[PDB]
Amino acid sequence: VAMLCGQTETNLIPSHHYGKAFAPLFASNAMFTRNQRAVITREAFVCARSAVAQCQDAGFLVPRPLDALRQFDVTSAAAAEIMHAVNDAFKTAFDLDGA
Amino acid sequence: MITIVVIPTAHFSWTDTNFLNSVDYRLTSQPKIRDRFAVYAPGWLRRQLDEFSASLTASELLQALQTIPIPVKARCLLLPKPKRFAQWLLDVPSANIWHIPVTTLRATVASKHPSSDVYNYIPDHVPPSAEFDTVTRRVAAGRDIYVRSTKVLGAPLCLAAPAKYYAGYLSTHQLDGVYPDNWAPDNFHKREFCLTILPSLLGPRTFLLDVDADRDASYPLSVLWPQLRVLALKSRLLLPPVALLRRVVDPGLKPTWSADSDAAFRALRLSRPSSASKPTGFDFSALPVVDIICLFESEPDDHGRVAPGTRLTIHSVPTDLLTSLSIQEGVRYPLRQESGMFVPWVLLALLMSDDVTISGTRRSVKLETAHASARPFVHITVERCASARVVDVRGSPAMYANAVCLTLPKGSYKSTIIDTLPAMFSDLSILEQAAVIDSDALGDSLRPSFETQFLERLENLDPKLLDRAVASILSPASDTSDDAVTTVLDVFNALYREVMTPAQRSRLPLLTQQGRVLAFAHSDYELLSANIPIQVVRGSIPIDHVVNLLARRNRVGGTALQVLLDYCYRTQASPLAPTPAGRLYKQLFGPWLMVPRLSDPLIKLRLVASAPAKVLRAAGWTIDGDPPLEVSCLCAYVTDRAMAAALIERRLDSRALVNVGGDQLMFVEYAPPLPLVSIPRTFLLPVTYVVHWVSPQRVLLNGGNVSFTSGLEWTFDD
Amino acid sequence: MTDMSPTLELTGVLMYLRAASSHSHAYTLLQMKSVFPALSLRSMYRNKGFGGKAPAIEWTEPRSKYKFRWTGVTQLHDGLRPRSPSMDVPTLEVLTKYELVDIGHIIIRERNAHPRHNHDSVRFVRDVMALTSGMYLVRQPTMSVLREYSQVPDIKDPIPPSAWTGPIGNVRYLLPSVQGPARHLYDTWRAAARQIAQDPQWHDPLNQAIMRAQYVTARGGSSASLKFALKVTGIVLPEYDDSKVKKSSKIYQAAQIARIAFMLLIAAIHAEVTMGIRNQVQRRARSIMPLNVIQQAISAPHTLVANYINKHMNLSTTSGSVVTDKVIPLILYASTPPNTVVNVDIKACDASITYNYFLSVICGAMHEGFEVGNADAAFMGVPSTIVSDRRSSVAPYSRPISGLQTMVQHLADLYAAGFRYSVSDAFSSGNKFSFPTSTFPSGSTATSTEHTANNSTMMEYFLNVHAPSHVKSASLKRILTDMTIQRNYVCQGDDGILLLPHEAASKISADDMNELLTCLRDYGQLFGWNYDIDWSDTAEYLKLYALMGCRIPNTSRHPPVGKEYAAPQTDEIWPSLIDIVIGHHLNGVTDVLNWREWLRFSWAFACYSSRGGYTNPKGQSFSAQYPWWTFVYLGIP
Amino acid sequence: IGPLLTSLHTIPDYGFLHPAIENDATTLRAERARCASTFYKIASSQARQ
Amino acid sequence: PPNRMVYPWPNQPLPRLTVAPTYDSAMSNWISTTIAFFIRVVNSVNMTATVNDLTRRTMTGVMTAMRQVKTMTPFYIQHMCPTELSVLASVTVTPPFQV
Amino acid sequence: VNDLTRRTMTGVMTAMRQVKTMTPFYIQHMCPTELSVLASVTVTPPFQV
Amino acid sequence: TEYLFYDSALKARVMKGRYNWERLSSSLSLNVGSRVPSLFDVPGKWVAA
Amino acid sequence: GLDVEAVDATLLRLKILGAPPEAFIAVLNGIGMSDSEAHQIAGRISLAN
Amino acid sequence: VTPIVNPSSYVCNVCNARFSTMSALSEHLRSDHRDDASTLLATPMINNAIRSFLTAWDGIRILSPDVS
Amino acid sequence: ANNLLNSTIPISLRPTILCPWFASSEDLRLQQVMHLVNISSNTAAALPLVEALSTLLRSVTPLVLDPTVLTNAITTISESTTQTISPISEILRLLQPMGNDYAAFWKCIASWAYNGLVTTVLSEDAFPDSSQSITHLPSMWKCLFLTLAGPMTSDPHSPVKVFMALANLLAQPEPIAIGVPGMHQTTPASQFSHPGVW
Ligand SMILES: [Zn+2]
């Protein structure tokens, strides 16, 4: 029915109609929030990976300046706890809301 | 003229004399301060928003409103139906300012179907086939607008013509609603600042006020809060309320150029020197509260040095509580009592607060108040008031003057607030301890106490199973551990259902049918399973109760039965979002805390209900005198005798079903429930009350039990 | 009219006399109510000389359509005789209490004279079952309300408090780690809520008109509570008393509401609800609990989701109610020899549905299920609002929620608070009062949707998950599998029918049946549903009775003399008696009585009804009567 | 039910409830008056079905 | 590849002057051929043996009518809809995710 | 198995495969130690083929 | 009617239908006085009930 | 409030009387049906089905 | 009236032991008061469970990766 | 905005502005992937996306769906009134406007934007029963609609499903070969949902 019953006003200029309709959308900075959140996402992700790796032995390819210090437990449980700590820290520092 | 857009918070007081006070009452402290602000926020706009709220999305509504100038100079001029409207241009020929032909006018008068022709070609005519924004666009022009419908937004809506044309075309209440707009305008003034509920384009001279509290859920524009906040956030346009007090505005705390050390900043110095002989000798529904930041510290080290300590935020503690206790900022009071418990006033502050969080972040914490934590706090200092505003209390958590039940987990400090607080005054009637119902009362009623019986049944099980259950309950990570705990739960459920329910159901009048009852329970289920018509409020306190009851050792159980009972009740309780118990406490005790601040004495009242002597004598009672007996159901307090008498002529549409036994145990029941909001907000009620004869000497002998019905009537007393 | 032997009538006389001799004639009759059907209907062909002819009914492939075909007859033989144990022992044991064992002996001996299924056998069954008392029992409404709503379900494994997330203002979502029937229930309602969420079928102005119009009827209640609550909040409602129409009518209150902005009325939903009672013939009196128009409007999402669950899962199990006769072939097919059927029904679904276990789960699922959708989209005049989200202890905040969710927020609040009824019985003297209860209103067909949905859900989980994991008999597992509700189970409100797949030329061992039925009882006990099941190779559904594909009219449920009256006064005028006669006669046709004698009795009834009169409160009298030809036109031969 | 009966003026043989009983139950809310009234009302109602 | 979107139908840039129904779009072609095929089916021998020709004459008639309706949808799909998608892709909280 | 079910089943299996579990490690490196010591103290020595 | 006609489109539809109907029924001279079911009479039915 | 059995009876009666299509349109529009669906419904009316 | 001077010493209810610091008193309550095997269920093992729970309490952490 | 709403800035000194509002594609790519990780991969994830986009589409569009001209062009066809079957009624009984203003059409369009996450399929019920013959008119009309609406869906298997839909009706007069064993020309067409069964 849709593809067989489509119709519009007689003397329609698409450019004017679309422009008049799209005007309210691009009216504020709100269209740029995702950029900022993405940036924080990146920094949070890298730091988390770095922290988890440093507690491991030669994990990934990160520098290990603190390697002189002892770290006996390397179980996955410890890694999860570390990652949660970092995740909470960033959420607190930058006052994030979503997951 | 810098503008500050304001979105009201959760319990924003609206009927206040000045909208300004509900924002932050410190702004009213100094004449030098209050003279710098305008308010606007007119009522007509408020009503329009109330209506359109159900018909526009947040984005649309914001997009529509944002362009409106501060003082709305335009009006919406409703036109009557063409048959009616056409006559106007001939009733006054000069009123035909569009000069519509006389022939057309009387052709309309003749036609069975008067057309829109009279509207046609009239400039700026808005037909019903129009949209909200069409009005708003014209509003920016300032000129009045002519419309053909009442549902319009942005400008005050008034009749274009005298009411005679609109009559019949519209009805009484409709014809009434436009009257203020018919003579709408009022001036707006050019002070330094102007607050506004109307949104606007955020910019260099427009700011968003941040109060750090949840919005008014009922307020129609609260949905705009996220979009507004984020836009302000991304441009650093938020203003903490304290910034308003400074001579020059800046977003920030602890600025360099100002020490912020002045009497204006100190919210604890609440003062009321002025007067106007107004009927509100006091409005006991409006309550000033504060959000405070307090620093906690432990014992110093071996060399007199001390740790950095931690600072927490306490939310919405009533200010009069602190003032009456002579609490002052910048003073390091001792926190711990001789026995190590908290000093009473701190406990009161916690109990009546709404929430406690870390100062910086937004994480809520339940504070411990026992010997659990190492390096425990011993000193406390209040540092500053993050916010200080008046809040509306009338009927908020509880609804009926009859009674209300508050549910709290076992181990709460209810004893402190119900005993120490009234004892701290013990001079003005607050409540009667015979009317408050301890949650443990029914458990104590059984000849072997419910706890003893539960213990006696429980010991029949193997000790190891019990040991496993207790450990599982304490250990948070012990998910379920079905075997041990479930067995105990079955015994608990079986016993409670067996004995507690009938015993509870046997105390129905004691819970509700007294003067005014305040009751505690361990779970809403305790009442629902017994069908007791009393409102139940699921409260919570911002302190860890588990550790607290772990310190109470003098009990029937060795601190292990207690935690078991605690878990059982919590399991028994229905899953729902619980509210802060402080709000209920604020509703009950809050108004009383403002009594000492008053300047003039109180005046007592009551709503005694009559009792014909016939039924009393017929019931074997020996009574002197013919006049019908009367009984005081509930006493109230005011201070302006004039308006109080002026408000005493209302006839409450709630009958009383009085019942009294031969033992003089007297009970009352209101067939239509008496709601608190029906009480005029200038009144003041005791927390609890007990019904009693107004003149016990009238009776000479109690016959049998008696019941009767009568009306209710507020009256003075001497 | 039924033309029964005097011996059976003799037993009924002794039955009534024994009941009348003791105190509380009504109570005594009520206790030993089911004796007659158990003695006769539940145990007929438990012998050796079994045989006869039986219908051969086939259920067409698209079973959802409930289409059946008569396809011949089947010879009866011993291998097809009923398998369930007889009912003689329990009934006789009960009768010993009232020393009426002679009645049982007489009935049993007479029954043993019909070893083969034919007209005589069923005719005997019809007659004996027609012996139960046909009195409309009535008791004090105060006692009735106090005895029925004083019950709370007993849950054998409550949902632990740690199984919920942080609050969303009022509701709590269910943690993913939780399994079991509750998880099944949660997912089902959530899925339905999702489907409801995006649906341009609503917001169609015509459909909106249907819903609002559906709320108004000539009857109604709770108007006084409405006027008080709104007057309490400062709302000055209009009045139209001069227009002579009852205030308590749902129409009247609806007219008062028309102008007001809806959100202003939100405080009024937490108001008292009046109640009424309708007596019954063979059970406790029913309850009528009419909500006010506003409350009925708020509960809309609950109804809508329930409807979708019904219409799109098991096709509402006939709750479309298009013509009630669709259940007739169903039970006939269900009672045929090749099929084994089990009758089930919730003990008190109205009293067992509750917030602590059930409604909380549903509210959470619906609120979560509505998350998929525009957060700012008003529904039925209810705008979106801001609510605080506390799922994350580290990152709490507030976000908008759609109008549907706002409705749920209030609806959950109301359910948690429990319904607050106000009783004002007139038969008792000066004793009106109010008390709350968790009992669901369930005053009309609007409740059948919710209970039927939950009924179907729990049954489905039991069949597919709980039973296979728990039952022991390997043969039972083999037959229990390959079975699903859409082609093995139907229900309406509490009532339900379960039929087994055709055991290959055989019947399931009663041992396995006992194992199966036992496990079902325990399964219902888990979440506090007493299932009240039975197995007697008969069909009870919506008060219809079928035996071996033959319908049995339970005439006792339509007593010739009895009629319900729920008020101290009859409050009716003489001409109405005619319509009573017409309705009375039709029942005697619907139920198959001796058509010649029934007609004779009917005319006599008509003759008496044909005449009547009236007197002015002070003045004149009036009189009239009809010519007999009227009744011919009204439908009496 | 007998003891709770008066006599009718139209048909002297049959009776109805005492006006005294219903008055006292209504006005005085007397227990025994109320109990008698309630019993009479429901007993009559059961017969009316 | 970034800043590109795939599209099941052929597409064109936005028209310049006023729009009008057309008959050379892909969708219109698909419609016409489909109708033409079914008309051929209806006239096949299989139908003739069982279907009264009068009804057959009617059925081919109504199918013919559908093929001649001057619907606007096919033009909109080819020329205007892609623009709407391209704009809205920058507005939704979740960017498009295609394969 | 339609496509939707096919992916659904696939997602379940791969999820089962991906989740971490220490059980295999315990079997290969820790369980034998526990068996060895326990066998030395149980009153009935192990019986094996 | 206000409760029934919350919006305006329905009211416009019914009014147009009623106006056209009576115009047709009289002009075409089918008949006059035909009580045709229409929404404008639904409130009337409610009031009578 | 309105009766379906009245509506279809009127529609069939109109169809038998051979009323012009706009008559059906007015009747359908009189019960809230929009013009487009009104035409759609009116077309379905036939003595055959 | 509200106190304005800290206690010179802190007191336990039954042991009559006086402590110069509340921390020392807290430990005494945390440890010495809590063996007391005198009831139907006051087993030593639950005392250990209670003792462990007491020591493990911390409700004012900003980060809490354990419970997150 | 596809160069619509063209705008520009003034030309003057702007000393101390700072607008940290941007990020690289890698950031966006990373965030998009992260977003896909924090969802349940069932329909619950896709539905809000499609719903939001569809609402936006319907919000701004010049196209208006109106079947009045189609029906007007259909009902004007003359036919005898003495026959027992009127195919016009059969057609108009189908194409029933459910009053939802054809949400399916906008739903299909929105699905394209997220075809890599969710696919739209033709409903199983909207198929001709495999037991019918081509002469069963309702079956024939159904097959016609499936053929017309085929391309609008994102399901890769839709063409085969369309082809088999007709093949079911012609299994009697016109047989063809089906590759995989266990499948026959009368198999329900909706089951052909595997690339190996073409
Ligand atoms: Zn000690």
Tab-separated table of C-alpha atoms in Angstrom, chain H:
chain	number	residue	atom	x	y	z
H	1	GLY	CA	-22.908	2.587	22.495
H	2	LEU	CA	-23.468	2.161	18.781
H	3	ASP	CA	-24.596	-1.222	17.470
H	4	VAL	CA	-22.599	-3.036	14.808
H	5	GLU	CA	-25.718	-4.983	13.849
H	6	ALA	CA	-27.412	-1.681	13.080
H	7	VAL	CA	-24.446	-0.402	11.079
H	8	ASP	CA	-24.046	-3.334	8.703
H	9	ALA	CA	-27.812	-3.572	8.264
H	10	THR	CA	-27.914	0.042	7.114
H	11	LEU	CA	-24.905	-0.439	4.845
H	12	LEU	CA	-26.341	-3.508	3.144
H	13	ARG	CA	-29.711	-1.786	2.872
H	14	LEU	CA	-28.031	1.148	1.151
H	15	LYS	CA	-26.154	-1.216	-1.150
H	16	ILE	CA	-29.364	-2.990	-2.146
H	17	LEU	CA	-30.999	0.383	-2.721
H	18	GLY	CA	-28.102	1.255	-5.030
H	19	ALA	CA	-27.116	4.449	-3.255
H	20	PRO	CA	-24.235	6.448	-4.750
H	21	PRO	CA	-20.835	5.885	-3.121
H	22	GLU	CA	-20.774	9.247	-1.338
H	23	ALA	CA	-23.779	8.071	0.669
H	24	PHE	CA	-21.634	5.260	2.046
H	25	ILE	CA	-18.810	7.749	2.598
H	26	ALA	CA	-21.035	10.020	4.668
H	27	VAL	CA	-22.368	7.126	6.744
H	28	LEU	CA	-18.901	5.722	7.406
H	29	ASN	CA	-17.515	9.170	8.167
H	30	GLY	CA	-20.414	9.584	10.582
H	31	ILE	CA	-18.810	7.037	12.904
H	32	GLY	CA	-15.299	8.449	12.776
H	33	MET	CA	-13.862	6.538	9.826
H	34	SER	CA	-11.456	8.702	7.868
H	35	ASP	CA	-12.168	9.325	4.200
H	36	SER	CA	-9.417	7.019	2.943
H	37	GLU	CA	-10.463	4.066	5.084
H	38	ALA	CA	-14.094	4.982	4.431
H	39	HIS	CA	-13.525	4.456	0.720
H	40	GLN	CA	-11.598	1.287	1.533
H	41	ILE	CA	-14.451	-0.028	3.669
H	42	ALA	CA	-17.155	1.083	1.244
H	43	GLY	CA	-15.522	-0.829	-1.589
H	44	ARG	CA	-15.627	-4.086	0.361
H	45	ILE	CA	-19.428	-3.921	0.518
H	46	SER	CA	-20.854	-6.461	-1.914
H	47	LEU	CA	-23.777	-8.856	-2.101
H	48	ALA	CA	-21.470	-11.742	-3.010
H	49	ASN	CA	-19.149	-12.163	-0.028
